[PDB]
């Protein structure tokens, strides 16, 4: 929009949707002010009407403020470029007040603003010079003066209230007091009185009370502070009043006067009168005093934006370009941050401001782009505010709801896990138990030329150490009567088809469930108990703050009582096999994986093997309490991969001829490396042919070429829906 | 399916893509077999029950358009329906547009409803602009039509109202005939009369196809984006310049798109000799076409015109390239028979004073004013170019 | 989006869930019930194989088992449909709450949808469809 408002855009035609703009002459940093397009339009009219030879943009706006009201109008009658960036801002009243009202405003404002420019050249220029070390010290000297003036205004407002609460007033009475305040601010702009007299107080006793209030204000307004040579009334007269005299069309027009009544009512309904006075003084104390622009830049507080909403967020903005002189209707600031965004660019783009650079026309463009670049992100935060903040609180509410309904599910799991333990003690007393649960070493089927194949001499006796990726053969003794039936039929059996079918159906009559359980160290028991009470007090702080979440905890316990199927130290680490078929040899090879079914690496410590036995005949539909439970001896499980590698290589690469006896060293120690992990490791080599060790262990610690016996019988279509059907099993078995 | 490309010697740039409109596209030739069932379907008359239930205006335009030309003129003259004049412009046997203008005035003469004669015998300016643009398309096809067009203009200005629309259409008529000097001089007369150049004539001038009867009818649906681009470019050029610069830009683009490059450079010659201040877009376009053509089709006075227009409004690099290409083409063995570009003392002093006026504010002119003065004075030592390369490298 | 919700509603209407219930009053009555998406039952079967001692169960006890087997199977269908139509309706609320400016009732057209809502109410208030 800056390139498009000049003469150079005439030699270009553009696409309206996405206009790629040209390189202007002010885009080059070597451009002087004489080659500027917009300055030469201003330097031409300055010699014509202002009658001053102007060689710089600094010299132009300085000469614009030296001008006389007969020359200030004559320049602005022939000047049509009010805005260049086309951002809607409040304007001086030369772009308003058509007719005779333009002339009498110019005789009033330009004579008054010349007093304010004389007030900034020597009086305030030495005061910022005295406190130029740390900023903000000037307005903090006026801060305790204005606070005593504000206490008189609260007492005057409390006398009008006559004790009753402002919320309890009739809606007509709220607009009646707000009508007086906007007409009081109109008399502050026109008549130049800080506390003007209105005809509302006709009582003689109230006039005496108002006269004591008006004289105490004017004594405070004319009380000079020690470090600053100016009084606080002359600061308001030349910084605060002179800025609002420039925009007198906001106050004289009766339509915008009705906007300020509705804007003051929404300010007073949610905020008391004691808080709106403290924030006015904070807006003057926290601020910046500009010497070149000649304005006092306030804090733009949330009470300040509600006070001046009709100036910066209403439809009072009238833009004037070379193309069209337009009156902007339906202009609306959404939130109070837009008034803070609009007034930031409005005070920074004042003429002769410190934010604007005046050395080159290139530096004037880059200082003006950044003032609108920072304003755009402030408006980009505004349009993202009400839909993302409501999406953050809605995402917060689901995580608190998920924490509450999980805390209500844990007592349902404790009473269910206790009741299946009590029914197991009554079943194991009467049923056939398993006695010998002994882990043994795997024997090698390979034998020499002298050995006999029919003897089978060795079978292993005991295991004290089981590594991670190693197989061990477990021994079980189950005295179920189906086991002794198959031991006679298989030893009786050369072979027919009807006899082999009788062998297979007897194996599926019962099964065994073998699992691996890890002991809990009492230090880790104190670590586990420290976190589960850390969440328990965390949930209870959430419940007390949000009373709706206390109601949802009662819903979850009443719902889980309906959905859950009714039933009437060591810790589980790895399930080894789901279904162990009935064998005459009573021995199966069980491969431990590196990762469990949950998908994490296994820790070290004591591990015992838990074996449960089931029979489909006497126990239909596989109730978990009706089983034959036996325990194995404790052993030690850890990883030998840091051990056996360091004993072999005595590392980041593995050589070519070294890799083939390296896997045989792993098989000598008991680990099971398959042919698929060996062949696919040789596909990823370097330029020297070196096999990566991290590629080999990642294929070793994966579920690709070796699986547990539990996940071996399942389908990929079953394993894909496994976290989906488990969550359907958790809602029916809470905890 | 590989068809050659006509040599416009137009610059490939996203700025002058509106200048690239009017170029014929082989994409339309590839699109052509898709339109064949549509034009095969459109040749058939509607049924009687649809035509009898048709509205009044639709039935009048679809019956008068199918009717013979003189019968339609007879119906118009009988029932005084003057608003069907653009229909009979599109007739199957309509004559050349001067005969149609005489027939229009004859129909207004013998009409059944006679208004007051100040409003009865006044044709709308859209009709006169369409007639003169048909005449200019025919002068593009055959330049010796122009004389009769002059006679036609010699009646229309004496009978109708001299508007900027018909004056811009007559400028397009003079341009399409190859008449360079009087077209620019009519444009300068419009600029001195503060008459705006018509934007539809400015768009049709830079589209040297598309006879405007089927443009207002709209049988060519594509390239309307190009028409809108040229109309908006004409409005943008008129916001900051007069009518003569817009007309000279249109003349340059028209002679570039009709492969008449000698008249394309005669446009710049006559615009410098007459006093028309060219727009900066036209000067940049002329410099890039000079770069595309390598200064081959150029003369000494056209070189002087380009250097004057570049010293007035132009960059240092464009002026330096134009002067260096002129000095190199003087030294080429092909152009040794042709005379060399020599600056007379008055225009040389004018060019050097305008360069010094630009260089008092610009540093890029102040660094190369000595090289410009050496290139104009015909004494060019190569040590200046060596020092220029040394300062560019360092 | 409205065609996928209709696709999901029509799917769970024709599907099949199952639920069992065992009598808590000592009897070995087990009932298995198959329940469609309309709430109806496709098959109700009793299992007497668990209880050998009989002739002590009244007809009120057998209806209490079947009431529990229907309540378990209907809640089985309502939980299966809450995981089939679950994540689709969760992504629906993100598309609609944060995408009001893409729909016909957000932004400047929210005033029209509110005007048509109040105008639809007065046309039901003019008749006795609302005031009764």
């Amino acid at each position: 929009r800056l390139r498009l408002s000049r003469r150079t855009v005439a030699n270009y035609v553009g696409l309206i949707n996405s206009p790629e703009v040209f390189d202007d002459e002010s885009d080059r940093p070597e451009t002087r002010w004489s080659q500027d397009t917009f300055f030469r339009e201003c330097a031409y009219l300055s010699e014509k009407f202002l009658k001053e030879k102007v060689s710089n943009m600094q010299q132009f706006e300085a000469a614009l403020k030296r001008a006389s009201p007969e020359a200030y109008l004559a320049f602005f009658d022939a000047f049509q470029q009010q805005t260049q960036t086309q951002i809607p801002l409040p304007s001086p009243s030369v772009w308003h007040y058509e007719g005779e009202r333009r002339k009498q405003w110019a005789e009033k404002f330009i004579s008054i603003s010349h007093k304010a420019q004389a007030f900034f050249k020597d009086v305030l220029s030495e005061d910022v010079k005295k406190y130029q070390e740390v900023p903000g010290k000037l307005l903090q000297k006026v801060k305790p003066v204005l606070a005593d003036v504000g206490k008189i205004l609260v007492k005057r407002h409390e006398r009008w209230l006559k004790g009753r609460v402002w919320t309890s007033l009739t809606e007509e009475e709220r607009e009646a007091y707000c009508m007086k305040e906007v007409k009081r601010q109109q008399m502050q702009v026109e008549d130049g009185e800080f506390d003007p007299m209105m005809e509302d107080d006709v009582d003689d006793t109230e006039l005496e009370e108002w006269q004591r209030e008006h004289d105490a204000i004017m004594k405070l307004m004319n009380s000079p502070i020690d470090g600053l040579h100016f009084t606080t009334l002359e600061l308001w007269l030349h910084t605060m009043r002179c800025e609002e005299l420039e925009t007198e069309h906001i106050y004289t027009s009766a339509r915008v006067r009705a906007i300020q009544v509705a804007a003051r009512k929404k300010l007073y309904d949610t905020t008391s009168y004691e808080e709106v006075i403290q924030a006015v003084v904070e807006s003057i104390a926290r601020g910046t005093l500009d010497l070149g622009a000649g304005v006092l830049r306030p804090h733009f507080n949330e009470v300040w934006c509600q006070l001046n909403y009709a100036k910066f967020g209403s439809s009072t903005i009238t833009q004037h370009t070379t193309t069209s002189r337009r009156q902007l209707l339906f202009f609306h600031a959404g939130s109070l941050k837009d008034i803070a965004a609009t007034a930031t660019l409005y005070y920074a783009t004042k003429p002769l401001s410190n934010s604007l650079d005046y050395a080159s026309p290139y530096k004037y463009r880059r200082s003006l782009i950044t003032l609108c670049s920072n304003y755009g992100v402030e408006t980009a935060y505004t349009t993202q505010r009400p839909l993302l903040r409501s999406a953050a609180n809605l995402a917060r509410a689901e995580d608190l709801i998920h924490a509450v309904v999980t805390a209500a599910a844990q007592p349902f799991g404790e009473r269910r896990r206790a009741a299946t333990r009590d029914l197991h003690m009554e079943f194991q007393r009467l049923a056939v138990p398993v006695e010998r649960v002994i882990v043994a070493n795997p024997v090698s089927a390979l034998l020499e030329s002298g050995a006999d194949p029919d003897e089978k001499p060795v079978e292993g006796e005991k295991v004290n150490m089981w590594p991670l990726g190693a197989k061990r053969v477990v021994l079980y003794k189950w005295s179920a009567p189906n086991v002794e039936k198959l031991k006679a039929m298989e030893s009786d059996a050369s072979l027919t088809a009807k006899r082999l079918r009788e062998i297979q159906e007897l194996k599926r009559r019962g099964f065994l469930e073998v699992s691996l359980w890890r002991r809990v160290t009492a230090q880790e028991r104190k670590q586990r108990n420290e976190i589960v009470e850390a969440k328990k007090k965390q949930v209870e702080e959430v419940v007390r703050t949000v009373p709706s979440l206390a109601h949802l905890h009662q819903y979850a316990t009443s719902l889980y009582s309906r959905i859950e199927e009714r039933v009437a130290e060591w810790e589980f680490a790895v399930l080894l096999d789901d279904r162990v078929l009935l064998n005459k040899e009573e021995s199966v090879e069980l491969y431990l994986p590196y990762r469990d079914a949950n998908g994490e690496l296994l820790a070290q410590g004591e591990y015992r093997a838990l074996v449960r036995a089931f029979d489909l005949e006497a126990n239909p539909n596989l109730h978990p309490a009706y089983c034959s439970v036996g325990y194995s001896e404790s052993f030690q499980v850890f990883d030998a991969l840091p051990q056996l590698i360091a004993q072999f290589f005595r590392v980041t690469h593995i050589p070519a001829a070294d890799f083939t006896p390296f896997c045989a060293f792993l098989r000598d120690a008991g680990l099971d490396v398959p042919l698929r992990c060996e062949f696919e490791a040789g596909q990823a080599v370097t330029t020297d042919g070196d096999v990566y060790m991290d590629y080999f262990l990642q294929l070793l610690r994966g579920e690709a070429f070796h699986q547990s016996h539990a996940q071996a019988g399942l389908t990929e279509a079953q394993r894909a829906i496994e976290p989906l059907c488990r969550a359907h099993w958790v809602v029916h078995h809470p905890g | 399916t590989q068809l050659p490309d006509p040599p416009y010697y137009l610059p490939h740039s996203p700025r002058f893509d509106a200048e690239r409109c009017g170029t014929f596209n082989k994409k339309w030739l590839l699109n052509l077999p898709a339109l064949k069932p549509l034009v095969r379907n459109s040749t058939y008359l509607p049924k009687k029950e649809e035509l009898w239930r048709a509205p009044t205006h639709e039935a009048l335009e679809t019956i008068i358009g199918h009717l013979p030309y003189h019968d339609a003129l007879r119906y118009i003259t009988e029932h005084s329906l003057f608003l069907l004049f653009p229909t009979v412009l599109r007739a199957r046997d309509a004559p050349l547009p001067h005969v149609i203008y005489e027939d229009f005035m004859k129909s207004c003469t013998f009409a059944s409803l006679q208004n007051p004669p100040e409003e009865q015998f006044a044709l709308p300016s859209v009709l006169l602009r369409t007639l003169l643009c048909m005449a200019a398309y025919h002068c593009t096809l055959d330049a010796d039509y122009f004389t009769t067009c002059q006679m036609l203009f010699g009646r229309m200005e004496q009978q109708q109202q001299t508007t900027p629309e018909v004056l811009s259409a007559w400028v397009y008529c003079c341009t399409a005939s190859g008449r360079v000097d009087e077209a620019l001089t009519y444009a300068k007369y419009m600029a001195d009369c503060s008459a705006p150049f018509d934007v539809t004539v400015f768009s049709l001038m830079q589209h040297p196809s598309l006879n405007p009867i089927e443009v207002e009818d709209g049988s060519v649906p594509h390239s309307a984006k190009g028409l809108l681009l040229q109309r908006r470019l004409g409005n943008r050029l008129h916001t900051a310049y007069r009518s003569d610069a817009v007309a000279a830009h249109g003349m340059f683009v028209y002679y570039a798109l009709t492969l008449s490059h000698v008249r394309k450079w005669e446009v710049i010659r006559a615009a410098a000799a007459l006093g028309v201040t060219l727009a900066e877009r036209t000067v940049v376009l002329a410099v890039e076409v000079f770069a595309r053509e390598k200064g081959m089709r150029c003369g000494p006075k056209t070189v002087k015109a380009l250097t004057h227009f570049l010293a007035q409004d132009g960059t240092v690099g464009h002026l330096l390239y134009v002067l260096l290409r002129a000095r190199k083409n003087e030294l080429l063995p092909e152009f040794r028979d042709l005379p060399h570009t020599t600056f007379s003392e008055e225009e040389q002093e004018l060019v050097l004073q305008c360069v010094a006026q630009r260089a008092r504010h610009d540093d890029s002119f102040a660094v190369a004013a000595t090289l410009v003065s050496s290139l104009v004075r015909e004494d060019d030592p190569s040590e200046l170019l060596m020092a220029f390369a040394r300062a560019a490298r360092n | 989006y409205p065609a996928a919700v209709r696709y999901g509603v029509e799917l769970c209407t024709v599907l099949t869930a199952e639920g069992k219930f065992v009598d808590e009053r000592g009897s070995g009555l087990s009932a298995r019930c198959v329940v469609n998406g309309t709430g109806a039952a496709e098959s109700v079967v009793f299992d007497t194989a668990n209880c050998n001692g009989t002739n002590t169960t009244s007809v009120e006890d057998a209806l209490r088992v079947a009431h529990g087997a229907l309540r378990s199977a209907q809640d089985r269908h309502n939980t299966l449909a809450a995981f089939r139509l679950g994540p689709l309706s969760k992504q629906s609320q993100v598309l609609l709450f944060c995408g009001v400016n893409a729909y016909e009732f957000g932004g400047k057209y929210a005033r029209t949808y509110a005007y048509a809502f109040e105008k639809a109410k007065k046309e039901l208030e003019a008749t006795a469809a609302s005031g009764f």
């Binding site: 929009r1 070379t322 337009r326 202009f331 | 916001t239 | 400047k108």
Partner: peptide, 28 residues
């Protein structure tokens, strides 16, 4: 809020489509 955005989209396209008359300067 939509009316304030669409009005600024309106007058930024009037500036793009149809440019107004350029004021006067003095040529060097």
């Amino acid at each position: 809020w939509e009316l304030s955005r669409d009005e600024q989209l309106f007058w930024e396209r009037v500036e793009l489509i149809r440019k107004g008359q350029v004021a006067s300067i003095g040529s060097s």
